[PDB]
Curated annotation (Swiss-Prot), chains A, B, C:
Name under which the protein is recorded: Outer membrane porin C
Domain of life, per lineage: Bacteria
Family designation: Belongs to the Gram-negative porin family.
Keywords tagged on the record: Cell outer membrane, Ion transport, Membrane, Porin, Signal, Transmembrane, Transmembrane beta strand, Transport
Free-text function comment from the UniProt entry: Forms pores that allow passive diffusion of small molecules across the outer membrane.
GO biological process, one term: monoatomic ion transmembrane transport
InterPro entries: Gram-neg_bact_OMP, Porin_dom_sf, Porin_gammaproteobac, Porin_Gram-ve, Porin_Gram-ve_CS
Stored PROSITE patterns: GRAM_NEG_PORIN
GO molecular function: porin activity
Gene3D superfamilies according to UniProt: Porin (2.40.160.10)
Bilayer topology term: Multi-pass membrane protein
PANTHER family per UniProt: OUTER MEMBRANE PORIN C (PTHR34501:SF1), PROTEIN YDDL-RELATED (PTHR34501)
Gene responsible for this protein: ompC
Organism of origin: Salmonella typhimurium (strain LT2 / SGSC1412 / ATCC 700720)
């Protein structure tokens, strides 16, 4: 919801109350988790050439009872934007590994999650300097790329998207922090068909694919699969764990789209993982789980 | 302040900074409680028939100091409205007992309080799935009902309102969670003349009644009274306390009304409870306490 | 961004994402500190005479990791406004000392800092009942006075600011909670030149001086300094810490405003404190540091 436009300065104030109640035999997941979101994108044209933007967004829960306050800044960054030189912006932002990893997180509820926020660059984090450049300096249309730097431990990364034509995105991203990661994804986008898959290796090799159709009265079914395997492991100081599977599941989900402002969705995580000494001490869940929600957004 | 309305999606954002310096002999109350609430109501017409909504207004303190943070989500939900088919909304929402109980929470400062928030659905809560139906299916003018449902522990209730005509309002509900508390009460609202009473017993009984008149220049005086009395009693694990009053007091008060957007108001709790083996440990305030401040809103 | 004006009720929503990267040899300093702030000014015209305003603005960190939350209400007060009798505003407000003390705090990033927040009335805090009078009952131009009163511990204070024609401003102020504190400052304000020096003494003496010049192509380059020397202090229940310096350093800085919504800045704090018995047992910093951020506001 754009709340202000005047003399080349525009502020969309966006956000939503998403209602949703997880079902499970798991008890760290059964319950109400209606959270909600606020955040604004800001903008200011300085000269025909640049723009000084700014962008924030925080989450805050609703399931937490009174007195208690489960809050946190999702993204919060300021930058600048020059004519066909692209843009730099430093703040709490997305790791530039997300650029490709993104295409697979699209599920109604249970997406990404083979990478985490503050998980050494693959997702969000703090202190990120970010130069991404769009339509390769105005000479190559449909080719984008970003070269990124991190705040503390110290890190770096790069990403290149490419819309090869049609809707076939192709994408790569490399990153390192002091632990590196590659990142390859290919998305199809066109005629209501969304087919995107992505995988990589780390310092430990994970995959994810997802396929949706967009029904016309407004309903986006989704079959999606993702996994992650590894190598040797270490409980804090010691404990030698062999090579097992981290998180692997098939997923059917459907979102219904009333209009922009209001969606409604059921999603069925069909879990695979087997209950063992791994998935006890680490406390990785093994139960297939299912969630319904009524989101209102603005 | 409805900040945006266009293409049948509105979004009133509302709030207030309400300053009040309590006064007391007690040190738990005596001091600055300058607090504030932001939030928004959001709408979206989907059809001739339905509109989706969503609403969130969470609290913050101006009394806590710098670094330390006292906030919590008062409400957060999203639901649908079908025309004459009532309205569903699940989430951090009000309780069904409150429908009826509310008519008594009209004091300048200290009203209701025979129930806290999260106090088993008599007020706010979490997981509160709800369907309310106004004007009874659009066949009876002014007889409205609710049947609600809670998250966990488990539960349910349901209210029936009726503006008998003129300015009267008879009111009733029951509720239950796994503790079952009922509700009876009346209100009268015609000629700046506000009269209202409510009470029920639980599983153990409490009552509240109030009277107000709205002055033409803008001064709504309120004398009001409420009390609670109890049966068998247990201090966490154990105890034998007998039957005593958990809270009973008479109230003078008078809100002044510059306009809608601004208010001043003096309220004087005239407590009756005597200092005893009850009000020492369980820590019930046994002091009469008097509040002074300025509510600015938008 | 004034977001509302209708029937003489205004509402100016502001905020800003100022992503800075602190450099130092410290480990509590060097790193990322993207903070951000929201805040609303409030307005409602009641008569020709009064217009009952209200303000608010809490902070929120963007460096704090996910799940964690670093917030605090900076100001949140409600007040009325009588034209030629002044303005009363009770709430989480600035202390009556800051009227003067302020003129020195204009440095790009670090400044003031001699007084803390909640630092016994010298700046921000809670419970402030405030009556300031502008243009002195409308009969003396170039003058303002204030006599404030705190909540709890108890206290009072006064202030007298006078822009003495041209661009010279004389500032005097006093506060006395039950330890006192005077305050004396001088600002010069005209042709692209700021010159502001101030000091005081508490129950313990401090001083701050700054001179910034406002360029024509944008860029206010700054030079500034401040020092605070005390008497006998004691660690909680003991320790005789002779006579030393809390903090003394010369500062250099430079904001570069692109326009009124975007700024870039560097701030080179040159610190002069030697590390000894004091700085080690009290967490006082011995290092000189560099600050580099990118404010965006609205």
């Amino acid at each position: 919801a754009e709340i202000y436009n005047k003399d080349g300065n525009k502020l969309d104030l966006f956000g939503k109350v998403d209602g949703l109640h997880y079902f499970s035999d798991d008890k760290g997941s059964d319950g109400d988790q209606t959270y909600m979101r606020i955040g604004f994108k800001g903008e200011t044209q300085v000269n025909d050439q640049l723009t000084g933007y700014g962008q924030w967004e925080y989450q805050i829960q609703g399931n937490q009872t009174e007195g208690s306050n489960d809050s946190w800044t999702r993204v919060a960054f300021a930058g600048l934007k020059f004519a066909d030189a692209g843009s730099f912006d430093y703040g709490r932002n997305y790791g530039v590994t997300y650029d490709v990893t993104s295409w697979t997180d699209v599920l109604p509820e249970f997406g990404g999650d083979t990478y985490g926020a503050d998980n050494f660059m693959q997702q969000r984090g703090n202190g990120y300097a970010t130069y991404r450049n769009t339509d390769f300096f105005g000479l190559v249309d449909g080719l984008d790329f970003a070269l990124q730097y991190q705040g503390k431990g110290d890190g770096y990364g790069g990403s290149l998207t490419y819309a090869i034509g049609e809707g076939f995105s192709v994408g790569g991203a490399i990153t390192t922090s002091k632990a590196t990661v590659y990142t390859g994804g290919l998305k199809y986008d066109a005629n209501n068909i969304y087919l995107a898959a992505q995988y990589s290796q780390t310092y430990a090799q994970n995959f994810e694919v997802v396929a949706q159709y967009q029904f016309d009265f407004g309903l986006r079914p989704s079959v999606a699969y993702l996994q992650s395997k590894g190598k040797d492991i270490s409980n804090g100081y010691g404990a030698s764990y062999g090579d097992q599977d981290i998180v692997k599941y098939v997923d059917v989900g459907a979102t219904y789209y009333f209009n922009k402002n209001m969606s409604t969705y059921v999603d069925y995580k069909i879990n695979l993982l087997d209950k063992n000494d791994f998935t006890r001490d680490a406390g990785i869940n093994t139960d297939d789980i299912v969630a319904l929600g009524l989101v209102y957004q603005f």
